[PDB]
Design an enzyme around this catalytic site. Structure first.
Site, PDB file in Angstrom:
ATOM      1  N   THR A  16      44.841  37.693  40.720  1.00 53.01           N
ATOM      2  CA  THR A  16      44.799  37.662  42.177  1.00 53.01           C
ATOM      3  C   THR A  16      43.900  36.556  42.719  1.00 53.01           C
ATOM      4  O   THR A  16      43.819  36.394  43.944  1.00 53.01           O
ATOM      5  CB  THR A  16      44.342  39.016  42.735  1.00 53.01           C
ATOM      6  OG1 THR A  16      43.120  39.417  42.101  1.00 53.01           O
ATOM      7  CG2 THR A  16      45.410  40.089  42.490  1.00 53.01           C
ATOM      8  N   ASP A  39      67.302  20.542  28.795  1.00 54.44           N
ATOM      9  CA  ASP A  39      66.308  19.473  28.880  1.00 54.44           C
ATOM     10  C   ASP A  39      66.548  18.395  27.834  1.00 54.44           C
ATOM     11  O   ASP A  39      67.704  18.114  27.492  1.00 54.44           O
ATOM     12  CB  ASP A  39      64.899  20.095  28.795  1.00 54.44           C
ATOM     13  CG  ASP A  39      63.865  19.350  29.611  1.00 54.44           C
ATOM     14  OD1 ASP A  39      63.519  18.214  29.225  1.00 54.44           O
ATOM     15  OD2 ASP A  39      63.416  19.874  30.653  1.00 54.44           O
ATOM     16  N   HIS A  69      59.374  16.049  26.831  1.00 51.57           N
ATOM     17  CA  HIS A  69      59.468  16.833  28.064  1.00 51.57           C
ATOM     18  C   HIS A  69      60.026  18.236  27.804  1.00 51.57           C
ATOM     19  O   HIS A  69      59.443  19.243  28.232  1.00 51.57           O
ATOM     20  CB  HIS A  69      60.305  16.042  29.070  1.00 51.57           C
ATOM     21  CG  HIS A  69      60.419  16.665  30.422  1.00 51.57           C
ATOM     22  ND1 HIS A  69      61.460  17.500  30.760  1.00 51.57           N
ATOM     23  CD2 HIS A  69      59.669  16.526  31.541  1.00 51.57           C
ATOM     24  CE1 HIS A  69      61.340  17.862  32.025  1.00 51.57           C
ATOM     25  NE2 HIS A  69      60.258  17.289  32.520  1.00 51.57           N
ATOM     26  N   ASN A 161      59.890  16.230  42.637  1.00 46.80           N
ATOM     27  CA  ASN A 161      58.559  15.630  42.695  1.00 46.80           C
ATOM     28  C   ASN A 161      58.463  14.494  43.705  1.00 46.80           C
ATOM     29  O   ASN A 161      57.715  13.533  43.496  1.00 46.80           O
ATOM     30  CB  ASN A 161      58.105  15.139  41.324  1.00 46.80           C
ATOM     31  CG  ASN A 161      58.249  16.188  40.252  1.00 46.80           C
ATOM     32  OD1 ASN A 161      57.887  17.345  40.451  1.00 46.80           O
ATOM     33  ND2 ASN A 161      58.729  15.778  39.084  1.00 46.80           N
ATOM     34  N   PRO A 175      71.322  27.660  46.946  1.00 44.01           N
ATOM     35  CA  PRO A 175      70.615  28.847  47.453  1.00 44.01           C
ATOM     36  C   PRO A 175      70.509  29.996  46.461  1.00 44.01           C
ATOM     37  O   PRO A 175      69.535  30.756  46.523  1.00 44.01           O
ATOM     38  CB  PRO A 175      71.422  29.246  48.696  1.00 44.01           C
ATOM     39  CG  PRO A 175      72.146  28.008  49.095  1.00 44.01           C
ATOM     40  CD  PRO A 175      72.440  27.266  47.824  1.00 44.01           C
ATOM     41  N   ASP A 200      61.872  29.057  46.660  1.00 39.24           N
ATOM     42  CA  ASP A 200      61.699  30.494  46.567  1.00 39.24           C
ATOM     43  C   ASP A 200      60.305  30.907  46.133  1.00 39.24           C
ATOM     44  O   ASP A 200      59.881  32.021  46.454  1.00 39.24           O
ATOM     45  CB  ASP A 200      62.704  31.078  45.569  1.00 39.24           C
ATOM     46  CG  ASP A 200      64.135  30.827  45.986  1.00 39.24           C
ATOM     47  OD1 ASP A 200      64.581  31.421  46.992  1.00 39.24           O
ATOM     48  OD2 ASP A 200      64.805  30.004  45.332  1.00 39.24           O
ATOM     49  N   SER A 224      58.556  20.245  37.026  1.00 41.16           N
ATOM     50  CA  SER A 224      59.094  20.553  35.707  1.00 41.16           C
ATOM     51  C   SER A 224      58.193  21.498  34.932  1.00 41.16           C
ATOM     52  O   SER A 224      58.667  22.192  34.038  1.00 41.16           O
ATOM     53  CB  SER A 224      59.195  19.278  34.878  1.00 41.16           C
ATOM     54  OG  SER A 224      60.330  18.520  35.218  1.00 41.16           O
ATOM     55  N   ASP A 260      48.197  32.415  49.798  1.00 41.31           N
ATOM     56  CA  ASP A 260      46.994  31.928  49.136  1.00 41.31           C
ATOM     57  C   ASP A 260      46.998  30.428  48.856  1.00 41.31           C
ATOM     58  O   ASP A 260      45.959  29.893  48.449  1.00 41.31           O
ATOM     59  CB  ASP A 260      46.756  32.702  47.835  1.00 41.31           C
ATOM     60  CG  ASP A 260      46.438  34.171  48.082  1.00 41.31           C
ATOM     61  OD1 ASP A 260      45.776  34.474  49.098  1.00 41.31           O
ATOM     62  OD2 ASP A 260      46.858  35.025  47.278  1.00 41.31           O
TER      63      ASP A 260
HETATM   64  C1  LIG Z   1      64.707  17.970  41.036  1.00 46.92           C
HETATM   65  C2  LIG Z   1      63.845  18.074  39.947  1.00 46.92           C
HETATM   66  C3  LIG Z   1      63.436  16.936  39.293  1.00 46.92           C
HETATM   67  C4  LIG Z   1      62.456  17.026  38.085  1.00 46.92           C
HETATM   68  N1  LIG Z   1      61.178  16.514  38.582  1.00 46.92           N
HETATM   69  C5  LIG Z   1      60.218  15.840  37.702  1.00 46.92           C
HETATM   70  C6  LIG Z   1      60.367  15.951  36.289  1.00 46.92           C
HETATM   71  C7  LIG Z   1      59.458  15.333  35.418  1.00 46.92           C
HETATM   72  C8  LIG Z   1      58.407  14.586  35.943  1.00 46.92           C
HETATM   73  C9  LIG Z   1      58.250  14.454  37.361  1.00 46.92           C
HETATM   74  C10 LIG Z   1      59.161  15.089  38.230  1.00 46.92           C
HETATM   75  O1  LIG Z   1      57.150  13.664  37.856  1.00 46.92           O
HETATM   76  C11 LIG Z   1      56.395  12.904  37.012  1.00 46.92           C
HETATM   77  C12 LIG Z   1      56.915  12.769  35.580  1.00 46.92           C
HETATM   78  O2  LIG Z   1      57.462  13.922  35.097  1.00 46.92           O
HETATM   79  C13 LIG Z   1      63.872  15.716  39.710  1.00 46.92           C
HETATM   80  C14 LIG Z   1      64.737  15.622  40.814  1.00 46.92           C
HETATM   81  N2  LIG Z   1      65.146  16.741  41.454  1.00 46.92           N
END
Ligand SMILES: c1cc(CNc2ccc3c(c2)OCCO3)ccn1
Length: 279
Positions: A16, A39, A69, A161, A175, A200, A224, A260
């Site tokens: 919490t 991935d 990754h 990102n 959605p 969400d 990610s 929060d």
């Molecule tokens: C939705 C999700 C994403 C995934 N985003 C993502 C994934 C890996 C990364 C990241 C950002 O930023 C820095 C390097 O590593 C990319 C585009 N649309």
């Protein structure tokens, strides 16, 4: 169960309050659930996976993770030290090349693969898919994520990102799936996290320690990284019988820590994933 000196994100999802370092969770630990990590692959031989990880599909010359990754994301779902659901089964689907790139047609095929392939696996407690990827808006990509969810898989996707509204990214904007933003250890929205009405839930996404290729570990940041916290949480909660694949995103939002996080734009949920485990 208590894991001392846990990564901050694991401690956060069972707390919490920010600023603690022990992860508390029911010992069932996602046993009997399965999580697909769609991935760059997974280094299944990493000692941290304990034989619970395997590659099931690749669209490239190897199923090995030549990037890191996918191994990092899989580690946050279910590795022994870095994972939320420490006894789940992990299935890797390599839709991204070793530079982290992939065509939408391949990503769509991988999602439809998981919707069928779960019928070839033993997952009595339920099935989750973690999608730490995305690009610009595509109705076909969103529809594939919607199909995967409809088939009985809890789909968790990264918001992106770009510090932008996730409505313009896919599968983030679909959605019916669980779109995950990123937060930091001080309960601030991560600087890069997308936002918007389509989100969400938030999970830990800044400075997340997990597994890496070559049997190693490292700390990286992104939505990610937040996504597999939520995917592992869903698997853990389904094993406990508290929710189902169809309802897990809503249940996680219902039971989240509320109000929060700082720097949440007006109109974006202020909800941080929380396991509500009472030791
Ligand atoms: C939705 C999700 C994403 C995934 N985003 C993502 C994934 C890996 C990364 C990241 C950002 O930023 C820095 C390097 O590593 C990319 C585009 N649309």
């Amino acid at each position: 169960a208590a894991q001392t000196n846990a990564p901050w994100g694991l401690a956060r999802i069972s707390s919490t309050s920010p600023g603690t370092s022990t992860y508390y969770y029911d010992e069932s630990a996602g046993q009997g659930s399965c999580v697909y990590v769609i991935d760059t692959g997974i280094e299944a031989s990493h000692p941290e996976f304990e034989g619970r990880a395997q590659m099931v599909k690749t669209y490239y010359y190897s199923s090995r993770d030549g990037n890191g990754h996918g191994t990092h994301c899989a580690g946050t779902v279910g590795s022994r030290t870095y994972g939320v659901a420490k006894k789940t089964q992990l299935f890797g689907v390599k839709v991204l090349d070793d530079n982290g790139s992939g065509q939408y047609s391949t990503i769509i095929a991988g999602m439809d693969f998981v919707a069928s392939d779960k019928n070839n696996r033993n997952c009595p407690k339920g099935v989750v898919a973690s999608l730490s990827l995305g690009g610009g808006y595509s109705s076909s990509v969103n529809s594939a994520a919607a199909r995967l969810q409809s088939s009985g898989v809890m789909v968790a996707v990264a918001a992106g990102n770009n510090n932008a509204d996730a409505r313009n990214y896919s599968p983030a904007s679909e959605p019916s799936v669980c779109t995950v933003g990123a937060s930091d250890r001080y309960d601030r929205r991560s600087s890069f996290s997308n936002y918007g009405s389509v989100l969400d839930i938030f999970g830990p996404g800044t400075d997340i320690l997990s597994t890496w290729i070559g049997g190693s570990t490292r700390s990286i940041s992104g939505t990610s990284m937040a996504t597999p916290h939520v995917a592992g949480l869903a698997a853990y909660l389904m094993t406990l019988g508290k929710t189902t694949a169809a309802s897990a995103c809503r249940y996680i939002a219902d039971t989240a820590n509320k109000g929060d996080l700082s720097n949440i734009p007006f109109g974006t949920v202020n909800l941080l994933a929380y396991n509500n485990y009472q030791a």
